[PDB]
Structure formats: structure tokens, C-alpha cells
PDB file of C-alpha atoms in Angstrom:
ATOM      1  CA  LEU A   1      26.752   4.572  20.026  1.00 53.92           C
ATOM      2  CA  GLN A   2      24.632   1.645  21.140  1.00 52.40           C
ATOM      3  CA  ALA A   3      23.800   1.522  24.842  1.00 55.05           C
ATOM      4  CA  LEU A   4      25.153  -1.606  26.519  1.00 54.28           C
ATOM      5  CA  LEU A   5      22.567  -3.910  28.060  1.00 50.70           C
ATOM      6  CA  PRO A   6      23.756  -6.346  30.784  1.00 48.60           C
ATOM      7  CA  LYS A   7      22.499  -9.437  28.931  1.00 46.73           C
ATOM      8  CA  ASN A   8      27.534 -13.069  17.949  1.00 45.05           C
ATOM      9  CA  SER A   9      25.749 -13.678  14.650  1.00 42.49           C
ATOM     10  CA  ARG A  10      24.001 -10.875  12.785  1.00 37.73           C
ATOM     11  CA  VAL A  11      22.289 -10.358   9.471  1.00 38.33           C
ATOM     12  CA  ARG A  12      22.127  -7.009   7.716  1.00 37.92           C
ATOM     13  CA  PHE A  13      19.248  -5.732   5.653  1.00 42.77           C
ATOM     14  CA  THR A  14      19.102  -2.565   3.746  1.00 46.16           C
ATOM     15  CA  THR A  15      16.548  -0.039   4.406  1.00 45.15           C
ATOM     16  CA  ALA A  16      15.182  -0.127   0.925  1.00 49.08           C
ATOM     17  CA  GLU A  17      14.741  -3.914   0.956  1.00 50.83           C
ATOM     18  CA  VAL A  18      13.012  -3.737   4.343  1.00 54.52           C
ATOM     19  CA  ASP A  19      10.796  -0.898   3.110  1.00 57.41           C
ATOM     20  CA  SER A  20       9.887  -2.737  -0.091  1.00 52.55           C
ATOM     21  CA  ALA A  21       9.064  -5.943   1.775  1.00 52.28           C
ATOM     22  CA  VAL A  22       7.078  -4.117   4.480  1.00 53.56           C
ATOM     23  CA  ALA A  23       5.025  -2.248   1.873  1.00 55.24           C
ATOM     24  CA  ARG A  24       4.158  -5.499   0.107  1.00 55.22           C
ATOM     25  CA  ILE A  25       3.518  -7.699   3.127  1.00 56.78           C
ATOM     26  CA  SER A  26       1.620  -5.134   5.181  1.00 55.21           C
ATOM     27  CA  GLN A  27      -0.834  -4.665   2.304  1.00 54.18           C
ATOM     28  CA  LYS A  28      -1.237  -8.397   1.791  1.00 54.16           C
ATOM     29  CA  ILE A  29      -2.052  -9.310   5.389  1.00 55.73           C
ATOM     30  CA  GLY A  30      -3.769  -6.116   6.538  1.00 56.44           C
ATOM     31  CA  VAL A  31      -1.328  -4.822   9.161  1.00 57.78           C
ATOM     32  CA  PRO A  32      -0.384  -1.131   9.098  1.00 54.39           C
ATOM     33  CA  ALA A  33       3.023  -0.426   7.571  1.00 53.97           C
ATOM     34  CA  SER A  34       3.500   2.171  10.306  1.00 55.72           C
ATOM     35  CA  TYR A  35       3.572  -0.631  12.884  1.00 59.72           C
ATOM     36  CA  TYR A  36       6.599  -2.179  11.174  1.00 58.36           C
ATOM     37  CA  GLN A  37       8.251   1.231  10.998  1.00 57.65           C
ATOM     38  CA  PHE A  38       7.661   1.625  14.726  1.00 57.15           C
ATOM     39  CA  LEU A  39       8.849  -1.834  15.753  1.00 56.99           C
ATOM     40  CA  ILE A  40      11.876  -2.509  13.576  1.00 61.27           C
ATOM     41  CA  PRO A  41      14.076   0.331  14.862  1.00 58.17           C
ATOM     42  CA  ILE A  42      13.322  -0.504  18.518  1.00 57.52           C
ATOM     43  CA  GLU A  43      14.170  -4.197  18.226  1.00 56.26           C
ATOM     44  CA  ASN A  44      17.201  -3.936  15.959  1.00 52.24           C
ATOM     45  CA  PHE A  45      20.423  -2.030  15.414  1.00 56.02           C
ATOM     46  CA  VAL A  46      20.081   0.950  13.123  1.00 57.63           C
ATOM     47  CA  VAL A  47      23.333   1.201  11.209  1.00 57.47           C
ATOM     48  CA  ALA A  48      24.587   3.125   8.203  1.00 57.74           C
ATOM     49  CA  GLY A  49      22.549   1.844   5.266  1.00 56.00           C
ATOM     50  CA  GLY A  50      19.926  -0.250   7.039  1.00 56.92           C
ATOM     51  CA  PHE A  51      19.362  -2.525   9.993  1.00 58.43           C
ATOM     52  CA  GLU A  52      21.334  -5.290  11.628  1.00 58.31           C
ATOM     53  CA  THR A  53      19.558  -7.979  13.574  1.00 58.88           C
ATOM     54  CA  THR A  54      20.880 -10.610  15.955  1.00 56.75           C
ATOM     55  CA  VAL A  55      20.179 -14.173  14.784  1.00 59.81           C
ATOM     56  CA  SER A  56      21.880 -16.108  17.567  1.00 61.09           C
ATOM     57  CA  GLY A  57      20.528 -17.098  20.964  1.00 58.17           C
ATOM     58  CA  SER A  58      16.938 -17.240  22.162  1.00 59.09           C
ATOM     59  CA  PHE A  59      15.609 -14.162  20.341  1.00 58.70           C
ATOM     60  CA  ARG A  60      16.256 -13.753  16.630  1.00 58.20           C
ATOM     61  CA  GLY A  61      15.722 -11.660  13.528  1.00 58.46           C
ATOM     62  CA  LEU A  62      13.853  -8.451  12.785  1.00 56.15           C
ATOM     63  CA  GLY A  63      11.041  -9.472  15.133  1.00 55.35           C
ATOM     64  CA  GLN A  64      13.342 -10.832  17.837  1.00 51.40           C
ATOM     65  CA  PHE A  65      11.139 -13.901  18.073  1.00 49.91           C
ATOM     66  CA  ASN A  66      11.828 -16.885  20.270  1.00 49.19           C
ATOM     67  CA  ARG A  67      11.006 -20.366  19.004  1.00 51.73           C
ATOM     68  CA  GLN A  68       7.911 -20.823  21.159  1.00 52.20           C
ATOM     69  CA  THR A  69       6.289 -17.649  19.839  1.00 52.35           C
ATOM     70  CA  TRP A  70       7.224 -18.488  16.252  1.00 51.95           C
ATOM     71  CA  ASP A  71       5.902 -22.040  16.570  1.00 49.43           C
ATOM     72  CA  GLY A  72       2.675 -20.663  18.020  1.00 49.50           C
ATOM     73  CA  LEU A  73       2.011 -18.873  14.737  1.00 48.92           C
ATOM     74  CA  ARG A  74       2.725 -22.040  12.777  1.00 49.76           C
ATOM     75  CA  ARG A  75       0.274 -23.881  15.017  1.00 49.66           C
ATOM     76  CA  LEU A  76      -2.384 -21.348  14.065  1.00 45.79           C
ATOM     77  CA  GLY A  77      -1.823 -22.329  10.440  1.00 43.14           C
ATOM     78  CA  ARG A  78       0.507 -19.550   9.322  1.00 43.77           C
ATOM     79  CA  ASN A  79       2.832 -20.642   6.522  1.00 47.07           C
ATOM     80  CA  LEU A  80       6.244 -19.944   8.017  1.00 45.70           C
ATOM     81  CA  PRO A  81       9.515 -21.847   7.748  1.00 46.77           C
ATOM     82  CA  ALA A  82      11.028 -23.342  10.901  1.00 44.40           C
ATOM     83  CA  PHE A  83      12.019 -20.729  13.480  1.00 42.61           C
ATOM     84  CA  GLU A  84      15.764 -21.122  12.999  1.00 43.15           C
ATOM     85  CA  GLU A  85      15.519 -20.651   9.232  1.00 46.82           C
ATOM     86  CA  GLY A  86      12.755 -18.060   8.980  1.00 44.85           C
ATOM     87  CA  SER A  87      14.001 -15.794  11.766  1.00 42.72           C
ATOM     88  CA  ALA A  88      17.157 -15.139   9.717  1.00 45.05           C
ATOM     89  CA  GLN A  89      15.103 -14.262   6.620  1.00 46.52           C
ATOM     90  CA  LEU A  90      13.563 -10.935   5.649  1.00 46.34           C
ATOM     91  CA  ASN A  91      10.172 -11.962   4.296  1.00 47.50           C
ATOM     92  CA  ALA A  92       9.397 -14.728   6.804  1.00 49.42           C
ATOM     93  CA  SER A  93      10.268 -12.496   9.753  1.00 48.82           C
ATOM     94  CA  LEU A  94       8.092  -9.675   8.408  1.00 50.16           C
ATOM     95  CA  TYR A  95       5.166 -12.055   7.894  1.00 51.44           C
ATOM     96  CA  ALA A  96       5.636 -13.328  11.457  1.00 51.41           C
ATOM     97  CA  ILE A  97       5.665  -9.799  12.935  1.00 49.60           C
ATOM     98  CA  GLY A  98       2.380  -9.095  11.176  1.00 48.06           C
ATOM     99  CA  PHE A  99       0.730 -12.422  11.962  1.00 52.03           C
ATOM    100  CA  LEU A 100       1.597 -11.885  15.623  1.00 51.93           C
ATOM    101  CA  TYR A 101       0.150  -8.361  15.523  1.00 55.15           C
ATOM    102  CA  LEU A 102      -3.103  -9.817  14.161  1.00 55.59           C
ATOM    103  CA  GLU A 103      -3.285 -12.492  16.849  1.00 58.17           C
ATOM    104  CA  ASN A 104      -2.446 -10.081  19.633  1.00 55.74           C
ATOM    105  CA  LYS A 105      -5.035  -7.616  18.349  1.00 55.77           C
ATOM    106  CA  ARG A 106      -7.685 -10.318  18.749  1.00 55.09           C
ATOM    107  CA  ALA A 107      -6.427 -11.178  22.238  1.00 53.69           C
ATOM    108  CA  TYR A 108      -6.421  -7.506  23.310  1.00 55.53           C
ATOM    109  CA  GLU A 109      -9.883  -6.831  21.939  1.00 58.09           C
ATOM    110  CA  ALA A 110     -11.323  -9.955  23.590  1.00 57.22           C
ATOM    111  CA  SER A 111     -10.083  -8.987  27.058  1.00 58.70           C
ATOM    112  CA  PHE A 112     -10.706  -5.248  26.753  1.00 59.25           C
ATOM    113  CA  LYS A 113     -13.914  -4.862  24.843  1.00 59.63           C
ATOM    114  CA  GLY A 114     -14.369  -1.547  23.062  1.00 57.78           C
ATOM    115  CA  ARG A 115     -10.723  -0.499  23.376  1.00 56.72           C
ATOM    116  CA  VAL A 116      -8.200   0.303  20.663  1.00 55.79           C
ATOM    117  CA  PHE A 117      -5.109  -1.808  19.962  1.00 57.68           C
ATOM    118  CA  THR A 118      -2.520   0.925  19.428  1.00 58.47           C
ATOM    119  CA  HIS A 119       1.043   0.437  18.150  1.00 59.90           C
ATOM    120  CA  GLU A 120       2.597   0.768  21.584  1.00 60.33           C
ATOM    121  CA  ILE A 121       0.102  -1.728  23.031  1.00 60.63           C
ATOM    122  CA  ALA A 122       0.860  -4.031  20.092  1.00 61.65           C
ATOM    123  CA  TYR A 123       4.572  -3.753  20.894  1.00 62.35           C
ATOM    124  CA  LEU A 124       3.946  -4.567  24.556  1.00 58.63           C
ATOM    125  CA  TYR A 125       2.092  -7.683  23.386  1.00 57.15           C
ATOM    126  CA  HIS A 126       4.874  -8.507  20.915  1.00 60.01           C
ATOM    127  CA  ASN A 127       7.622  -8.265  23.520  1.00 58.43           C
ATOM    128  CA  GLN A 128       5.965  -9.744  26.617  1.00 54.58           C
ATOM    129  CA  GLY A 129       3.537 -12.156  25.000  1.00 57.21           C
ATOM    130  CA  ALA A 130      -0.207 -11.696  25.249  1.00 58.99           C
ATOM    131  CA  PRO A 131      -0.589 -13.262  28.709  1.00 60.82           C
ATOM    132  CA  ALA A 132       2.159 -11.160  30.297  1.00 59.58           C
ATOM    133  CA  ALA A 133       1.160  -8.034  28.376  1.00 61.67           C
ATOM    134  CA  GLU A 134      -2.364  -8.219  29.759  1.00 61.31           C
ATOM    135  CA  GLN A 135      -0.810  -8.697  33.217  1.00 61.39           C
ATOM    136  CA  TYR A 136       1.263  -5.517  32.846  1.00 60.08           C
ATOM    137  CA  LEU A 137      -1.723  -3.489  31.659  1.00 60.26           C
ATOM    138  CA  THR A 138      -3.789  -4.579  34.656  1.00 61.82           C
ATOM    139  CA  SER A 139      -1.075  -4.701  37.339  1.00 56.25           C
ATOM    140  CA  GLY A 140       1.646  -2.300  36.164  1.00 52.15           C
ATOM    141  CA  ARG A 141       4.350  -4.913  36.776  1.00 53.85           C
ATOM    142  CA  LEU A 142       6.291  -6.565  33.935  1.00 53.39           C
ATOM    143  CA  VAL A 143       6.484 -10.358  34.014  1.00 55.24           C
ATOM    144  CA  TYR A 144       9.696 -10.194  31.976  1.00 56.72           C
ATOM    145  CA  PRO A 145      11.254  -6.912  33.205  1.00 56.19           C
ATOM    146  CA  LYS A 146      14.746  -7.233  31.686  1.00 54.58           C
ATOM    147  CA  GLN A 147      14.103  -5.014  28.662  1.00 56.05           C
ATOM    148  CA  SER A 148      15.758  -1.953  27.117  1.00 56.93           C
ATOM    149  CA  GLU A 149      14.954   1.595  28.225  1.00 55.74           C
ATOM    150  CA  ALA A 150      13.252   2.305  24.894  1.00 60.09           C
ATOM    151  CA  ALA A 151      11.084  -0.787  25.352  1.00 60.64           C
ATOM    152  CA  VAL A 152      10.160   0.119  28.915  1.00 60.80           C
ATOM    153  CA  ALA A 153       9.250   3.643  27.762  1.00 63.02           C
ATOM    154  CA  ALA A 154       7.031   2.194  25.057  1.00 63.22           C
ATOM    155  CA  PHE A 155       5.314  -0.052  27.618  1.00 61.03           C
ATOM    156  CA  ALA A 156       4.615   2.881  29.939  1.00 61.46           C
ATOM    157  CA  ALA A 157       3.104   4.818  27.030  1.00 63.00           C
ATOM    158  CA  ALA A 158       1.079   1.726  26.106  1.00 65.48           C
ATOM    159  CA  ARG A 159      -0.429   1.458  29.576  1.00 65.26           C
ATOM    160  CA  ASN A 160      -1.236   5.200  29.543  1.00 66.24           C
ATOM    161  CA  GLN A 161      -2.996   4.817  26.203  1.00 64.47           C
ATOM    162  CA  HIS A 162      -4.823   1.744  27.469  1.00 65.66           C
ATOM    163  CA  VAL A 163      -6.208   3.290  30.644  1.00 64.97           C
ATOM    164  CA  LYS A 164      -7.176   6.707  29.298  1.00 65.31           C
ATOM    165  CA  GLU A 165     -10.396   6.986  27.299  1.00 66.76           C
ATOM    166  CA  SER A 166      -9.135   9.538  24.785  1.00 65.65           C
ATOM    167  CA  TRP A 167      -6.166  11.614  23.692  1.00 65.77           C
ATOM    168  CA  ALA A 168      -5.637  14.483  26.108  1.00 63.76           C
TER     169      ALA A 168
END
């Protein structure tokens, strides 16, 4: 039973086709497959036989990208289709998730020298955007606070991981 959040069109992908595409793309672009396995179930509906993803409104597809974030990657030179087309596609959305991870990793490492970009930190960056993610890490307040309980839990873990020097 999916929890109702206060805030029509979906696409369904099978687990196997997601897994196959993740394995291929993650290897190609140098992003851990485990990051995709972490992110996809948080952002999308896990249903019998795979995942369903909303492709209407501001946030779309497996990565739940908005157009501005998607277009940012294109501006960097990433070969993606237009937001509205690619966000409804398996491969393009998986490339975008990974390209964004790579960009956010650079942003995190530039602001916090010597620290490790963990999966939960990467998800914070993915969801809030790098500027707002850095703001949450430093201030403890979300710029865009209307997120799911699972997301908020991930962000709290991310900040814990960020501040603490080691596992403990």
C-alpha cells in the first residue's frame, strides 16, 4: 500500500530490463550500480514485476528529473534527448541519473575537501540540487522540504555521514 503524499501518466519497466540497463550503463560511465539500486526504489513505485514511474508534471521518469536539471546536463555536453522525451525512456533516464551523480560528486568534493560522496549524500544532491543540498548539510534545513518520509530519512542519514569522520 503506497503512502499518500499531499501533493496521471505512468510508464512501467520490468526489473530485469532495469537491471540489464543499469549494469551496462553504470559500467560505461563509471557510476556504481549500487547507487541506481538505492535510488530507483525510493523515487518510484515498486510494483509486481518491476517499477512504475510518473511521467507527467514537473518531475518525471526513473530519476524524477525536472526540465531545468535535465537541461543542465545537456548544457554540460551530455548526449541526452529533450527532457520530455528522455525522461519517459529507460536508457536516457539511467544515463541522466548517472551523469548527475558524477556532476554532484564533483560539486560535493569541491566544497568539502577530503570527504566522501556517499550514496545517501548523492541522493540528497539528486533530490535537492547541489546548491540546496550543500545548504542542508551546513544548516540542517531543507530548501525544498516537501519530500517523502523515506527521502527525509535518507537526508538525515546523509548529514550524519557527512559530519562524522568515520563509521561508528
